[PDB]
Amino acid sequence: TRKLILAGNWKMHKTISEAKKFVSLLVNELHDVKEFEIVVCPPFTALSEVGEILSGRNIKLGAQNVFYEDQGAFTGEISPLMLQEIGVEYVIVGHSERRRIFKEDDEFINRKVKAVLEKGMTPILCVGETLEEREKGLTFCVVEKQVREGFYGLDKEEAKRVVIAYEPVWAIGTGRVATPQQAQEVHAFIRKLLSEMYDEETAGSIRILYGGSIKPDNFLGLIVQKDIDGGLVGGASLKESFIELARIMRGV
Amino acid sequence: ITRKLILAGNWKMHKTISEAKKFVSLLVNELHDVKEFEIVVCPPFTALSEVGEILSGRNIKLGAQNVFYEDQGAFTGEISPLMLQEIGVEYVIVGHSERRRIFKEDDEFINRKVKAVLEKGMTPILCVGETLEEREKGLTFCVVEKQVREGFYGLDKEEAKRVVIAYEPVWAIGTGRVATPQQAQEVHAFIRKLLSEMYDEETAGSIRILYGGSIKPDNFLGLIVQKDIDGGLVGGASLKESFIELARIMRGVIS
Amino acid sequence: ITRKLILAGNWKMHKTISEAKKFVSLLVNELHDVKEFEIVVCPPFTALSEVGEILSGRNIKLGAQNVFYEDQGAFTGEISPLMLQEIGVEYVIVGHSERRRIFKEDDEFINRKVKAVLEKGMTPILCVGETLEEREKGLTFCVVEKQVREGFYGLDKEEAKRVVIAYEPVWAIGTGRVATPQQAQEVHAFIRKLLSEMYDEETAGSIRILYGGSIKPDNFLGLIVQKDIDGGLVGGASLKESFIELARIMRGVIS
Amino acid sequence: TRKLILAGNWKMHKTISEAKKFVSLLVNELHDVKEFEIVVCPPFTALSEVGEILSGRNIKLGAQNVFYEDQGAFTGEISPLMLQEIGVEYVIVGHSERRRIFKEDDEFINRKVKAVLEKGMTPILCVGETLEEREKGLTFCVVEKQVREGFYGLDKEEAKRVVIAYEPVWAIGTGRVATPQQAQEVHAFIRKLLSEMYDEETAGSIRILYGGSIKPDNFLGLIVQKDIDGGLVGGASLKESFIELARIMRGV
């Protein structure tokens, strides 16, 4: 908790032309932000161009993925350095799409968490169970494994910097949001677990946001819950609905 | 038969928008009269837009190191063909060893990227190559054939001509162990006979097959001379000015 | 609550029909009055029929080291539940580490074998256990829970009682590094609380949970004494006569 | 070529009770065999019992799989020793079912070929393309890879002992047999390749049998072809149809 976050993950969606316009629209409508942070994550291609429009502004730059090496022969990948030089503050790691479609495993993910922290950036670690896992009663152990694997090797001080995002796979793009009751139950669990790995202090420092079918007509009720520190917006982050959400987010 | 030679530079994960903007301008002027073939630079996504304008109207061409096969969608961290087409990218490396080995990218996955790149009017550069163990078992030809057949599957005579293949023996990637022009040529000749049966003589003669072991400024002359080697997919050397050297060498084989 | 202790021997890939016939007869007489618990021998498929007759009517019970979940079909090299049931097999080890690690046998695959074994009126012995790395990340409990939940999935109160679990910490398999009775007991207690939530008190108390690290004739006494350890899944020691020793020890904990 | 083989792969099909009867039926109807070999492959459970009924008889004992170690901690597996002691002469390795359902890779397979030869038994190496592979034009390279991987590390003398069985996956149990023309084309190819790896001598020594939907009303026409040295019978090997096949096999 302590400083909510409204993060938008555009995913594979905008052209440098569109980004420039859209970002500006946001920066105009939200130049005034009541401390709760607002992050926008455009694709690699449009990062530098968006960097400008944001430089010096309140809204912060976010990236969708990163490799764990400063440089090397890894054709197609982007290094932490390249993201830093552009002024990217947040980096999404472990997104369900990457885990599932691109077969990224926990170790791979864990090695990325550190790399993002090394260059003093904030990693957004994604966790979440699949419907099948939820039905077998593995919701918690699945989240627990991912979290433990994610933080493995981090000290109380680094762990404090990490951001967690619970995107229940059964609710990504399916339009089926988890009730605030279901969201909170897992968020709470993550918080308790977080403290058992460290201490009540770190656990309260780490921000855990909800992700998965975050629409304007359901965001209130999710941010209201005790342990949900904001959201990782998917679709809604592409339109102007990202403003109505940021608006609601100001209701606290 | 004629075929336009090609010299491509795969920077890989190496430069920042600054280092990039510099190096690129340098070249835009060094290789200014060079119009007898194509020099392609492939910077990281982060730095394409910048380099993109340093080339708008110049001779050197823009190329990406990877692409996803869809136009847009729920695919965090991926770049679409439309995103590359806006910036003015003309070439896209597809199926590179690193992606196949390290990022478990399979043939069917790669085949879709090939068709995808072609749909937007861009040029795929399909990479194929054996492993040391593979070559030791005599599987060089079947490893290459499988990859060529898979990659081209579904394409037709027309689309096939637009593809560019790049033979990159894995046992010669960054290990320094470049391939003797004999070895290179042998394989390139095969890939061309194969391409012949798959489609026809005309087609197999239109498709450029570049080499990719450890192309250095010294040995490169002993390769481009070969019969079935139409250019090179350069790694390291594409970083330094030695790239501008290679570009020189290649010019002394055309008229 | 009562629960009948169980001592099982997983010969693994070790004896021939001859060595087998010998060892078995030896036992049939040594452990002759032993009827306060169950001794189970698990020879390789090749040698089941032989050992099978050396037990027909005796006290010691027959057990297999693996099974496929179908009754018959196009599955070269596999053994069916019917094939085991004819010979008179009563126990079937399912989900052993070696099979999970070496032969890529997954949870869903193992769950089907559990149901299958139960259908023919036989007893599954589901093996669960963490890895050194897993225990170092504090994943012991979730690794075990996942495996227990997966394995039992679909079963009900009745069928669940018939299952026999065997906690076999992988970092203690053939490495000699047996587990302190503290560690063993801790986990066994968890697996039993879990089994309690999954079904109920009655059920969790009926299910035997055996230990399986490096059960030797000396340390075995410090384990069977524990509260939640109902017996042992013995590897090596099940080969020699030391097995007959362990069987002795276990007898001195019943009345 | 040189000494055809009629091999029956029961797969997962008989009880020790049934085996004893059935085998006997065969041993009675075929105690007289015009040199062409007849192998029967029952499941592990029934091996020793069938061993007796066959001991001293013409029909030979075959197994469906084996591990590559004489002994060790490999719960559920059977060693070469265990097969030998029972008098098993042939061992099927690399059967499509094992490759596909049980994920056995070429190395695994190759390590089994040697192990079977060590204890002086004859391994039956299975190879074959899937429909999809056949359509992409990979029929040959697929067979070539499997064969090369299978023989890797074998000398002219061991390689001579190896038996090859081409079971086109698209024809296993599908009831769709390959025409003799299609069968021969691949068999021929394997023979040419076999010689290029060794010499015309070894290539002619190695026996290559067809496998896949071998029924009595199509066996003749397959054994007739030049490079098909017999068959690996699946279903047909379970009934008495295994006798009509053995009967036809005698027509040469």
DSSP class per residue in A200-218 = HHHHHHSEEEEESS--HHH
Contacts 24+ apart (CB under 8 A), B104-110: B104/A103, B107/B146, B107/B147, B107/B150, B107/B151, B108/B150, B109/B69, B110/B150, B110/B151
Subunits with 3+ Cβ pairs within 8 Å of C are A, D
Is the Cβ–Cβ distance between D62 and D46 less than 8 Å?
no
Q: Using N-to-C axis directions, what is the helix angle for B17-30 and B242-251, rounded to 10°?
A: 30
Residues from chain C that touch D69, judged by Cβ atoms under 8 A, are 13
Contact C102 D78 (CB under 8 A): no
Contact B243, B28 (CB under 8 A): no
Which residue in this structure is represented by tokens 């085996």?
D19
Pair B62, B55: CB distance under 8 Å: yes
Using CA atoms, how far apart are residues A237 and A152, in angstroms rounded to an integer?
A: 31
Instruction: Classify residue D201 by burial, with Cβ atoms within 10 Å: 0-12, 13-18, 19+.
Output: exposed
Q: Tell me the domain boundaries of chain B.
A: 1-255
How deeply is B104 buried, as exposed, middle or buried, from its count of CB atoms within 10 A (0-12, 13-18, 19+)? Answer: exposed
Q: Which phi-psi region, left, alpha or beta, contains residue D212 (left: φ > 0; alpha: ψ -120 to 50)?
A: left
Name the minimum distance, in Å, from the CA of C62 to any CA of chain D: 13
In the block, tokens 């090397």 appear at A72
Q: What angle do CA C13, D91, D210 make, to 5 degrees?
A: 150
Please check if D10 is assigned to a binding site: yes
Other C-beta atoms within 10 Å of C19: how many? 15
Q: Does B153 touch chain D (CB under 8 A)?
A: yes
Q: Which of D136, D145, D152 sits opposite B142 (nearest CB)?
A: D145
Using the 8-state DSSP alphabet, how is residue B164 labeled? E
Specify the residue for token string 């980004």: A19
How long is chain D? 252
Q: What angle do CA C246, C247, C249 make, to 5 degrees?
A: 60
CB count within 10 Å of CB A149 equals 20
Chains that touch D (3 or more CB pairs under 8 A): B, C
Query: Cβ–Cβ of A9/B82 closer than 8 Å?
Result: no
CA A43, CA A14: separation in Å to the nearest integer? 7
Q: Which residue has the tokens 């969708």?
A: A64
A145 vs C142, C150, C198: nearest CB: C142
Structure-derived torsion over alpha carbons of residues C192, C198, C203, C208, reported in degrees to the nearest 10: -40
- Chains A and C form CB pairs within 8 A to the count of 23
Q: C239 and chain D: CB distance < 8 Å anywhere? A: no
Is there contact between A and C if contact means ≥3 C-beta pairs under 8 Å?
A: yes
Take residue B128 and report the two structure tokens written for it: 């194929």
- Per CB-CB distance under 8 Å, the chain C contacts of A145 are 139, 142
Which entry of A95, A97, A149, A187 is annotated as an active-site residue?
A95
8 A C-beta contact, residue B187 and residue B140: yes
The tokens describing A158, both together, are 């680094």
C182 Cβ under 8 Å from any chain D Cβ:
no
Compute CA distances D99 → B155, C107, D70, D128, D175, whole Å.
30, 20, 22, 11, 20
Q: Angle A180-197/A139-151 helices, nearest 10 degrees?
A: 40
Measured in degrees and rounded to the nearest 5, phi and psi for residue B54 equal -70, -5
**Assigned token pair, C90:** 């009563």
Can you give the length of chain C in residues? 255
CA dist., res. A37 & res. A231, Å (int) = 11
Residue found by looking up tokens 């109505």 in the block? A244
CB contacts, 8 Å: B73 with chain A = 11-13
Query: Residues of D numbered 97-136 whose beta carbons fall under 8 angstroms of chain B's beta carbons: which are they?
Result: 136
Tokens 């995913």 correspond to: A11
Q: What is the 3-state secondary structure (H, E, C) of chain C?
A: CCCCCEEEEECCECCCHHHHHHHHHHHHHHCCCCCCCEEEEECCHHHHHHHHHHHCCCCCEEEECCCCCCCCECCCCCCCHHHHHHHCCCEEEECCHHHHHHCCCCHHHHHHHHHHHHHCCCEEEEEECCCHHHHHCCCHHHHHHHHHHHHHCCCCHHHHHHCEEEECCHHHCCCCCCCCHHHHHHHHHHHHHHHHHHCCHHHHHHCCEEECCCCCCCCCHHHHCCCCCCEEEECHHHCCCHHHHHHHHHHCCCC
Residue C43: CB partners within 8 Å, gap ≥ 6?
Answer: C11, C15, C20, C24, C51
Whether D193 has its CB under 8 Å from any CB of chain B: the answer is no
Q: What is the largest CA-CA distance in chain C?
A: 49
User: From the CB of residue D77, how many other CB atoms can be counted at a distance below 10 Å?
Assistant: 25
User: C166 with C233: CB under 8 angstroms?
Assistant: yes
Q: CA-based angle B50:B54:B58, to the nearest 5?
A: 145
In the three-class reduction of DSSP (H, G, I as helix; E, B as strand; rest coil), residue A153 is classed as coil
The set of chains that have 3 or more CB pairs under 8 A with A is B, C
Contacts of D152 in chain B (CB under 8 A): 137
Residue type, A35: E
Token pair in block for residue D100:
């596909």
Q: Which residues pair with D12 in a beta bridge?
A: C73
Contact status of B24 with chain A (Cβ, < 8 Å): no
Q: Which residue has the tokens 């570049």?
A: B210
Q: Which CATH superfamily is domain A1-252 in?
A: Aldolase class I (3.20.20.70)
Task: Kindly name the residue from B105, B130, B168, B188 that is annotated as catalytic.
Answer: B168
Quick one: closest CA in B to D145, which residue?
Answer: B139
Given a contact cutoff of 8 angstroms between Cβ atoms, the answer to whether A181 and A224 are in contact is: no
Residue tagged active-site, from A37, A97, A133, A167:
A167
Q: Which residues contact B203 (CB under 8 A, 6 or more apart)?
A: B157, B160, B161, B195, B196
* CA–CA separation, C50 and C44 (whole Å): 11
Residue B9 assigned to a binding site: no
- State the Cα angle at D177 between D175 and D183, rounded to 5°: 160
Query: How many CB atoms lie under 10 A from the CB of residue A213?
Result: 20
Rounded to whole angstroms, how far apart are CA atoms A19 and A35?
24
Say yes or no: A144 contacts chain C, CB-CB below 8 A.
Answer: yes
Query: Can you read off the two tokens belonging to residue B10?
Result: 């795969």
- Residues shown for chain A: 252
Judged by DSSP in three states, A7 sits in strand
CB contact under 8 A, C65 and D76: yes
Give the CA distances from residue A170 to residues A102, A135, A173, B73, in Å, rounded to whole numbers and listed in that order.
18, 11, 9, 17
d(CA B182, CA B169): 13
Tokens at residue D52, please?
């007796």
Rounded to 5°, the CA angle A112-A114-A119 comes to: 100
CB D114 within 8 A of CB D91: no
Q: Per residue in C66-79, is it b (16+ CB within 10 Å) or e — as a string?
A: bbbbeebebbbbbb
Tell me if B16 and A81 make a contact (CB, 8 A cut-off).
yes
Chain B: residue whose CA lies nearest to A63: B77
Residues in CB range of A105: below 8 A, 6 or more apart: A99
Give the C-alpha separation, B212 to B179, whole Å. Answer: 9
Kindly give the pairing relationship between strand B231-234 and strand B38-42. Answer: unpaired
**Both ends of chain C: CA-CA distance in Å?**
15
Residues of B in contact with A46 (CB under 8 A): 49, 83
**Dist CA A44 CA A64 (whole Å):** 8
Which positions ≥6 away from B42 have C-beta within 8 Å?
Answer: B8, B9, B10, B11, B62, B63, B64, B65, B91, B93, B238
DSSP state of B150: H
Cβ-Cβ contacts under 8 Å between B and D: the total is 23
Is B77 in contact with A71 (Cβ distance < 8 A)?
no
3-state per-residue secondary structure call for chain D? CCCCEEEEECCECCCHHHHHHHHHHHHHHCCCCCCCEEEEECCHHHHHHHHHHHCCCCCEEEECCCCCCCCECCCCCCCHHHHHCCCCCEEEECCHHHHHCCCCCHHHHHHHHHHHHHCCCEEEEEECCCHHHHHHCCHHHHHHHHHHHHHCCCCHHHHCCCEEEECCHHHCCCCCCCCHHHHHHHHHHHHHHHHHHCCHHHHHHCEEEEECCCCHHHHCCCCCCCCCCEEEECHHHCCCHHHHHHHHHCCC
Q: For residue D137, which residues of chain B lie inside 8 Å, CB to CB?
A: 149, 198
Q: Do B146 and D141 touch (CB under 8 A)?
A: yes
Distance CA B89, CA D10 (A): 59
DSSP string, A97-141: HHHHTS---HHHHHHHHHHHHHTT-EEEEEE---HHHHHHT-HHH
Instruction: Give the gap in angstroms from C-alpha C5 to the nearest C-alpha of chain D.
Output: 23
Q: Do C87 and D16 touch (CB under 8 A)?
A: yes
Residue of D nearest to C83 (CA): D15
Q: Which residues contact residue C36 at a Cβ distance below 8 angstroms, ignoring those fewer than 6 apart?
A: C5, C251, C254
* DSSP secondary structure code for residue B13 in this structure: B
CATH dotted code for B1-255: 3.20.20.70
Q: How far apart are CA D61 and CA D37, in angstroms?
A: 11
List, in sequence order, every residue forming a beta bridge with D6; answer none if it has no partner.
D38, D231
Residue whose C-alpha is closest to residue D5's, from D24, D28, D25, D33 = D33
**Roughly how many angstroms between the first and final C-alpha of chain D, as a whole number?**
13
- DSSP classification of residue B63: E
Note whether C12 contacts D64, CB cutoff 8 Å.
no
Known binding residues of A are 9-11, 172, 234-235
**Beta carbons of D16 and C70 less than 8 Å apart:** no
Q: Whole-angstrom Cα distance, residue B57 to residue B73?
A: 32
Q: Resolution in angstroms for this experimental structure?
A: 2.8
Contacts of A197 in chain C (CB under 8 A): 138
Q: CA–CA separation, B237 vs B240, rounded Å? A: 6
Give the whole-angstrom CA distance, residue C234 versus residue B90. 65
Long-range contacts of C105-114 (CB under 8 A, 24+ apart): C107/C146, C107/C147, C107/C150, C107/C151, C108/C150, C109/C69, C110/C150, C110/C151, C111/C150, C111/C151, C111/C152, C111/C153, C111/C154, C112/C69, C113/C66, C113/C67, C113/C68, C113/C69, C114/C151, C114/C152, C114/C155, C114/C163
Reduced to 3 states (helix: H, G, I; strand: E, B; else coil), residue A142 is helix
The reply, when asked if residue D9 is annotated as ligand binding, is yes
Q: Do D12 and C103 touch (CB under 8 A)?
A: no
Contact D45, D16 (CB under 8 A): yes
Judged by 3 or more CB pairs under 8 A, whether C touches B is no
Tell me whether residue C130 is one of the annotated catalytic residues: no
Touch of C by D (3+ CB pairs closer than 8 Å): yes
Cα–Cα separations (whole angstroms), residue B175 to B12, B169, B172, B214: 16, 11, 6, 8
- Per the CB < 8 Å rule, is D173 touching C86? no
**Size (chain B), residues:** 255
B33 vs C111: CA distance, rounded Å: 70
Provide the token pair at C232.
């042992």
State whether residue B185 sits within 8 Å of chain A by CB. Answer: no
Show the DSSP H helices in chain A as ranges: 16-29, 47-54, 80-84, 96-100, 106-118, 131-136, 139-151, 156-159, 180-197, 200-205, 216-219, 241-249
With contact defined as beta carbons under 8 Å apart, do D93 and D163 qualify? no
Helix (H) or strand (E) holding A39: strand A37-41
Neighbours of C185 (CB within 10 A): 18
Specify burial of residue D107 (Cβ count, 10 A radius: 0-12, 13-18, 19+): exposed
Spatial distance between the Cα atoms of C254 and B147, rounded to a whole number of angstroms: 66
> Residue type at D204?
G
Do A142 and A169 form a contact (C-beta atoms < 8 A)?
Answer: no
- Which of A1, A93, A4 is closest to A41 using CA atoms? A93
Question: Nearest CA of chain D to the CA of B209: how many Å?
Answer: 21
Q: How far is CA B136 from CA B171, B190, B214, in A?
A: 11, 18, 20
D136, D145, D148 member nearest B153 (Cβ): D136
B96, B98, B130, B134: which is the annotated catalytic residue? B96
What is the three-class DSSP state of B211?
strand
Q: Using the Cα atoms of residue B149, residue B154, residue B156 and residue B159 in order, give the sign of their dihedral.
A: negative
Burial of C171 (0-12, 13-18, 19+ CB in 10 A): middle
**Nearest chain A Cα to C149, which residue?**
A136
